[PDB]
Amino acid sequence: LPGNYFVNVFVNGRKVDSGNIDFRLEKHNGKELLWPCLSSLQLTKYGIDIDKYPDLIKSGTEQCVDLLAIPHSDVQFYFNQQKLSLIVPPQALLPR
């Protein structure tokens, strides 16, 4: 069900945060899924270089970025494990 869930966030196999994220229904090519609203600040927090993909904001907003703008990426919410997993290419990561 849509709403706020306390989740562990992982980027490229690394746990980078734990907290409440709002998930809403989003229809992608005839399939409904729960999709996270992530801010440009939250993406930065998770180690993603938002400046290399300006379309995160331009095709979305700063409050809720367009995650489909990062090429060759996968976003998966594992509801039972309370786990949000983001897979991004190595070049999407910050110098950290």
Question: 25 near 32, Cβ under 8 Å?
Answer: yes
What is the rounded CA–CA span in Å between residue 76 and residue 95? 24
For 24, the domain range is 1-96
How many distinct structural domains can be found in the chain? 1
Q: What is the resolution of this structure in A?
A: 2.0
Number of H helices, E strands in the chain: 2, 5
DSSP string, 35-66: EE---HHHHHHTTB-GGG-THHHHTS-SSS--
Around Cβ 22, how many Cβ atoms within 10 Å?
A: 14
Q: Residue 2, exposed/middle/buried by CB under 10 A (0-12, 13-18, 19+)?
A: exposed
What is the rounded CA–CA span in Å between residue 44 and residue 26? 23
What CATH number does the domain containing 61 carry? 3.10.20.410
